[PDB]
Amino acid sequence: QFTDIDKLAVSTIRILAVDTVSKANSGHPGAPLGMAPAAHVLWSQMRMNPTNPDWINRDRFVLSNGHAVALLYSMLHLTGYDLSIEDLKQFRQLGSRTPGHPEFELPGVEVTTGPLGQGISNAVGMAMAQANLAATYNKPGFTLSDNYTYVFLGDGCLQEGISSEASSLAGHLKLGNLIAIYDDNKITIDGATSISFDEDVAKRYEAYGWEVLYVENGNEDLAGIAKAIAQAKLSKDKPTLIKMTTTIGYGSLHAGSHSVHGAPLKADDVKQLKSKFGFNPDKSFVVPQEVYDHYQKTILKPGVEANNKWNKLFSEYQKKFPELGAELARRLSGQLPANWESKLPTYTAKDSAVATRKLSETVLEDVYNQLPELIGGSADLTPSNLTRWKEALDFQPPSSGSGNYSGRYIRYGIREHAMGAIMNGISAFGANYKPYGGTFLNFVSYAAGAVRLSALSGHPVIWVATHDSIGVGEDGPTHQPIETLAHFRSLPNIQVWRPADGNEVSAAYKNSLESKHTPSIIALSRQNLPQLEGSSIESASKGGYVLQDVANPDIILVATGSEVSLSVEAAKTLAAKNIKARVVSLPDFFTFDKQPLEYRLSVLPDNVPIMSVEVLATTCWGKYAHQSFGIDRFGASGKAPEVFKFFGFTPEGVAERAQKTIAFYKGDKLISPLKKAF
Amino acid sequence: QFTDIDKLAVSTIRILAVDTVSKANSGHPGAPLGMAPAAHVLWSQMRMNPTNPDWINRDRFVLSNGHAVALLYSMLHLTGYDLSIEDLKQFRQLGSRTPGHPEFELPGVEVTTGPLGQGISNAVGMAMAQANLAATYNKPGFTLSDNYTYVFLGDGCLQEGISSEASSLAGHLKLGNLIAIYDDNKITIDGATSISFDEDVAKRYEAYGWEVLYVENGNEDLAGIAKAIAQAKLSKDKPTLIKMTTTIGYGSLHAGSHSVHGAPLKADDVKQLKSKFGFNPDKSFVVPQEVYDHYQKTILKPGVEANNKWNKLFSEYQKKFPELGAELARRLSGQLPANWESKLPTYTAKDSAVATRKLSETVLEDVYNQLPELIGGSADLTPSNLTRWKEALDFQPPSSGSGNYSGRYIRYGIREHAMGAIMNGISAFGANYKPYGGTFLNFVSYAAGAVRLSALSGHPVIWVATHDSIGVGEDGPTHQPIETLAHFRSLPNIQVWRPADGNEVSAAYKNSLESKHTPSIIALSRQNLPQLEGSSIESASKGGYVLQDVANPDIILVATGSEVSLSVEAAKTLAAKNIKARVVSLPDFFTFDKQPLEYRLSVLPDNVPIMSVEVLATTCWGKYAHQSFGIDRFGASGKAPEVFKFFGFTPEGVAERAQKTIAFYKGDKLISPLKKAF
Ligand SMILES: Cc1ccc(C[n+]2csc(CCOP(=O)(O)OP(=O)([O-])O)c2C)c(N)n1
Ligand SMILES: Cc1ccc(C[n+]2csc(CCOP(=O)(O)OP(=O)([O-])O)c2C)c(N)n1
Ligand SMILES: [Ca+2]
Ligand SMILES: [Ca+2]
Questions:
Q1: Which residues are substrate-binding (chains A, B)?
Q2: Among 3.40.1000.10, 3.30.70.270, 3.40.630.30, 3.40.50.970, what is the CATH number of B1-329?
Q3: Residue B250 burial class via C-beta count within 10 angstroms: exposed 0-12, middle 13-18, buried 19 and up
Q4: Å between A253 CA and nearest CA of chain B
């Protein structure tokens, strides 16, 4: 039952955001001015502790339409999160805590958004993650998980394919606790939606299996908005979209125009806004005491009280079910089981050749029993990626009869970009969820919006990217990565492992799974690769190490993945013509660059020509070698030995090229490429 | 009305496509078998000439589920295209005309497909270019343009978000002549569709404004399928989707399973299939002469007659409408207007500072009327990207009141991947279509599935990517490109132009528009750059040039875009304390790499340290530079000059690093990075 204070709360949210943008002299005022009533009605009714933004059973809210940040920054300040008027008075400025689009790093901001389509897709991970937790640990008497995931979205997020991929899957899985509120404002940047987007959203979403409710006066009807949220909460086995119509820039002297989407309202427009809302035209960043006190009784103090009850029931649970309690307690502290690493496989050069892909499968076989928080899947490639262990149970709705929500194998369908973002949402949930998803390395490029954000936020998701080159063969150039790794190695904060054998696969799994702030790509072979004499988890964990040494070498050859063996063989050949060649295995650029310089310079020393061997683009290699043998053109369709042969990657093709490199440089002094001037 | 020969032709396609997979012992047999009837029936009513596969008014066929290619090669053979049983007998083998997934470059293959969701979105572009040709050239009595676009597709294509962006825009544009038949086989790789895809496709499609017809028996109802395509051709204002149900692998002992998705059938199963259809189990690649006779009659001879009447008519047309007939003949021979290049703007250093973004807009305004084949557009950032000339009309249904199909400016919505595949479809249509699309440089990444195929197939599409660096400012890290250029510079066959001033934006445009086979990305500044002294179109068209030279440079500074003015200022600092810098402006890696080595070595010689200056990733720069100053971490939200200073990119901060580069190398002899050893 909304009184005049609820109407005072809504004008302070709108004008605070107006103020924020106008001081910054930059930012988007329009959606904050129209979404403010929905923010007030929703937040007031979400169960959350502002003093503990990390309580696992907190309701989660994602602002998918990240450009509306000043609405999230006002709410965060007013409902009592650590963020202040001074923070806000520095919206969009160098160094401040208030950047131009929300970032995971701030408290009460759940994932970073700004790229459209990302927030709504992350929220689907969050709801899958709650569905899984609740299923795993809730016991009759102890309902430790039952929260909701509220999403805010625009027309933009409904146009991007990722949210149609995500929504299709959310609908399949029956994710009842996911509630999206669509700001139907009939405007985006170029103008009116009818110029390019006139589909029937509601019918589109009901087709997916979502329930759709409507609110027609979202600009003033707090009860309407209120009853929709409440009806949505009864939708136990359908996600809900609430389509709430609003006017962009409500109150503004140019509301409904598209000029109010991303520029500060002008001075005189803001003053009439203050007068009309009963605020003073010449005062800014003003919060009535009545608003703090309101949210203090409405949210902060029940939230703390709710958080506090949770703690006591969790402790009776650790008494009642000591080992499940022990498990959840660990995940919540964010440590992995002690000494889990002992279940990782090791091999010698005595055991068989095996594609790095079937070795990948053996890690998953050996570790899932040890790490309950490891939840995996595939974007329809399960038998190609070898990404599901034998005793698994699929994550499905219980009605399906194929699996249930305790299951740990997500079937993603042909939805890469969606799986990238759903993986980020499962990881941003907490309780130590280790998400992975497989596909073919060539199609991880589809997911690139989502993967740049696993890197910007630091979400340790794992991509199991199999079929990593022309050794795919006959599927041809549409399915053969050329530029893929080079790309992702130019992206700050992401591990790109390309293992050469069994020990190096175990080191890629170990470092990826132990990571707390870097995502990983494990690039894996379709084809059989031999076990190497002298690979080791320990050594490959440094990301780059001398695999085969000689005294006073003529050349250093550096290879990644399937080219390490080819380089060892070319190394025998160079030896018989009396050339000493050192073979270096660089499984991950990132991890090796995290090494201390004096390590790096023992692996890639001065005064020795250094040549790289890798069947993908040579563009990222100048930082480790002097001359590079790689492929800077698309591949080809044929038997895989023949495509390798057709491009030169043969032991005598590498040896020839090492010889031409020794010859080119005899007499010159050579500096290591690692060394920089400044 | 179909007869016995129509059923013999359908068995001949079934078994010929099976013998092609089994021969390769690699491939996908299932969708060939189940889809053979719709192929027979659809192709028999297409108007096409096997003899002339480039006839502008041919009905166009796209197979979007590209893995089903054994079938597209069976029909191209059978209907008289240049492909023999021999070519069929080296399917998937190194260097044959039969790749494991179709490539644009083959006669009768329209676009490269195989990546899911790419076919359908390209077919939307091809229907947009048809509608634009028809409204621009069709006259009373002269219907030079009226073809249909047909697309085969499957479950995989429907789950990729790019076909949902594409279908939405298509429904908005009311593209009546685009007819999609979907293989509703209830199987994908992982198993049944219900394990993760059980949305109501039909209701979803009606939501976009598409008409949906249903063929309950695709397996044998020739009459029904024909009815459906006939009905489909009546609706001029709805694109049509035919949900046709089939059994994957019809006629196989394991028909209806995911086993027959991508494995050659078992020999014993191939034998029974052949007996089952009246063929000899012991013979291969058998084609009844009645089948050959049948298609020569129903498809090739009609086809050749249609092409001949079309020609007669186009000759009358150029008598009746000279200009228009000369223009369409020019566009049809692929030539640009003569001397179009002279309408491009030149500037001197006495001209004013302008962002290269505004300067792009003035090229577009100065050449759109010279080039009627130029069709522009943005993905909802028209006022940011500055992509629209003034007098433009938008490409809309006539029914809209906002344009008609003679419009040349498209409002793509917030659909970037789909803009990508659609500009590839427009280019692939012919008539010298020159599509260009605007977005933010950081979000071209959203469209990587399509940008890769632009380069593999060689469709010379232009992306106008404004807002290239931390000069974007206050929106910060989510919107500032870090790795984007080093990604597309590692892609074979794409210009990535990053012009520093007007004369370089003109050169970028000239080189991109003359291109017949290589796409282009032009990265542009949000912020004001000045007009350099030393640029010119001629120099800038070589891709790397010496902007200012000195006799005997102590250092060469290689820079691109907003950093070339910075480097010319750093060079003024250095001069003052008598270091001689040569400043090299490198606007495109591709075009420069294409120069004669003699030219490149006169730009980047031996025996001088070369330091590169660019505010994005340094990884790619090892090929031209000894030391590189750039950003290998994400950005910051702040006013742009402040963010540049934070990162060190000031005149004196560049000068300073040049000084440490000189001092690091003094007394080493240096070899230009361009010199390769093999
Ligand atoms: C992936 C992507 C592309 C381009 C943009 C730029 N952009 C920001 S909002 C928007 C569309 C505005 O529509 P909206 O969600 O309906 O916003 P509103 O507040 O209603 O005006 C665009 C294109 C981006 N942030 N993310
Ligand atoms: C972007 C993308 C990712 C992954 C694949 C690999 N792939 C090809 S078909 C298929 C999905 C099952 O496809 P379908 O269209 O239902 O075909 P059918 O022949 O009906 O089984 C998979 C995952 C692809 N070609 N492109
Ligand atoms: Ca909007
Ligand atoms: Ca299928």
A1: 28, 261, 357, 384, 467, 475, 526
A2: 3.40.50.970
A3: buried
A4: 21
